[PDB]
Structure formats: structure tokens, C-alpha cells
Amino acid sequence: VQLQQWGAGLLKTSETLSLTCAVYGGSFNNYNWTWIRQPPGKGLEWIGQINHSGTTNYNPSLKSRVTMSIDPSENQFSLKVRSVTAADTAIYYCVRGSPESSGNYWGHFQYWGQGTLATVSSASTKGPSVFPLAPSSKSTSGGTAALGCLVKDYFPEPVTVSWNSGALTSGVHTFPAVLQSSGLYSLSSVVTVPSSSLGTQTYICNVNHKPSNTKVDKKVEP
């Protein structure tokens, strides 16, 4: 069972949030297809469910603003949330709910999608500037160097950073973004490496800000 989801992203107050989830594995028609959301740094709120008969149940917290829809042909189901405010900024997860066979007897949420962030703001999309954090000409007493990339002034979340197209993962720390007073995000991604690697190993940070279509590969050298 794999759940692939897309949509949400940046939208303005009073606009309509739209998400779609596609189910891989078969047995689409047997289940309540479910949406659950999580505001940043907060808990989980069940939004509602739809089955292949188009039968719904929405949380009264949101019910007046929600429409779910289902396309059994394409093993897809969707969410709309109307008249959004900052209260709707959240990670939205598509989830497999209870089977027809047994309902709440088998009602635990085993299968979750990776989630999609909705950001409710009037602010512009803005791609980051990517600046090298060059390894010092003086390494640690014990022969370790640190280097990184500063990913500065972007909106909205998220960004991804890899090193050497994912070949370098050990000692990587991609910091949680700081929301600056300006309302733009900034983060650093750093890695520690052997001093002895600096002469012969190329270090490149791969930055992707999908919201702005920004994709930057930045070589970091002494």
C-alpha cells in the first residue's frame, strides 16, 4: 500500500485549499479514505472520510468548509477546504481508514501519505539565495572540518538540501528554518568531514525550493 499526495501549497485568506491522494496496491473500494491535518508544532485533527459510494463523514470542527470527492476509476480521492485562514496552515495527510468488512473494529490508521503543507498567507513566493559556508583554513585539533550552505530568505516552506546528490549523509545537519521578522525563512545545512578529504573530495549542496521552482547546486571549497 502506497499513498501519493499533492496540492495545497501557498494560498491567500478566503481561497480554497485542494489536495489529491492516489492509492497504489489495489483494494481501493474496501476502505474509508481519510484526511488528517497537523498545524506546525501542534497535534493531529481528523478532517473526515469518503468511501467509494461517495458516503462522507466530516468533523463538525470543519464540516461547513470541507468537500471530499472520490474517483474509484483512478483510485484517487480529494479534499477541498473553503474560506481558509491562518488556522488552516498545516501538514495534510491522506490516510487509509476503516474497511467495509468491520468498520471501527479495524479502525486504526496504519497507512499514511508523507503529507503536504498548506501555507495561508498574503506573502509572495520567493526563492532562496544559497551561499557557501567554506571550511576554515584551520581545521579542529583532531582533523575534522565543517562546511555548509546558507539557504537565505525564502517563502514558503519547505526546502530540501542534499550533499553530493545524496552520496554524503553522515554528519549532515540541515537546521530547522528560522522565520525571520521579515516573514522570510532562512536555514543552514552543514556537514563535518575529514580534514584529509578536503584536497580530493568535492562537496556540493543540492538545494530545492519546489514552491519557487528554485534548484541550485553550490560547490563549497576552502
Place this chain on the structure above:
Amino acid sequence: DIVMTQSPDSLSVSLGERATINCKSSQSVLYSSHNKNYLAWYQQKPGQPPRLLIYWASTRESGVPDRFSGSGSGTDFTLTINTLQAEDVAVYYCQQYYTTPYTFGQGTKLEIKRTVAAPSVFIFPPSDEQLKSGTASVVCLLNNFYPREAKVQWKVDNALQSGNSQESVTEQDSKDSTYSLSSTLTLSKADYEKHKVYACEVTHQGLSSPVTKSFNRGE
């Protein structure tokens, strides 16, 4: 609605010891017909969806080791994590699936207590590229320390800085149970070029004395 309340909101438990997280439902979630509690426990790591651990209050999901134990009935439930492992760092949620709307506990954040580990400290001057743009970001990195509590003080030509820095701390590492921290000093190009010595001073329990990393602008 059935209100789900967890206790505590956060806890810090040593490697190899026992974590206990309580969950109360405002109404019984015992389906008397089946003698099953419609109560689930989830483990959520940063940037991941929740992972189901337990259904029916005490039945482990596939792939969950028996260190995770669910107990209780009716309104009062407990998740016990025995022989705590580094990879258990997460927020834990209870949830009722007794009746719609389905409702989650507020979450309990579990921190791993490990031995004290001193940070390695690095300072990065602003890039030439950034200076062209009229701003200078100076970065101080504290790498792989425990505990979380750390003091970073910026000094410019020996003057203590206030109001011009921002910190970010990583989530606790799922392998070595450490934190890392960035502190970023943000100046105008003009202010940056007015001063010579840029220093980061770190105070932490694992350090014999506060550690300073510094550079002279243009050296």
C-alpha cells in the same frame, strides 16, 4: 466529542530505562460487544507521518518490538516503552477510533537522556557572494552536544552583541541522542566592514571552560 488528554506533555528518560505515557478519554472507548478498546498509539518523528504502534489498546502493529507495551481499559490507557533506545526519540499520540469525529491526544514529547557530550564549535565568515548583496551572515555551529541547554554569545571587537542573532536547534539525533545548534549573526555590509574580530563564545556543561572560535575580517 471524546476528549483525549495525555500526561505528561514531555519527558526525558535515560537509555535502557522505562518511559511511561498516560492517555485519558473523556468517555469509555470499550466496545463491550467485542471487549475491545478502540484506542491506538502512534510514534511521530520529525518530518514523518505518525507510525502506528498499537491498536485495540495493547496489540502491537507489524514491525513494532515488544519493548512497546499498551495497557488499560475504558478511559485510562498507558504506553510503556521498556529498555529505551536512541531511535525511540519522538512525539507519541493516543487516539480513539470508537466514534466520529476521531480524536487524538495532544502528544507527549520523549527526549533520550544520555551522557554529557561537548559540542565541537566552528565559525564561518560571510561569503564574498553574500557581501555583494549588502548583508553579512556570520554562522557559529555547535555540533553533536548533550544536554540541549547551551549559551552562545557573539562578540565583535570584544563588544557583546544583542538583538542581531538567531538560533536554530536540530531535533535530537535518532542514533547518538545529541543536538546541534546554529547561531547566525546578521549585520549590514557597512557594519561588518567597520569591525575586525568576529567571535562566538559557547558555554555548555560538557566544556571544561567556555570555548571561543573567532576570525579577523579578511584573513
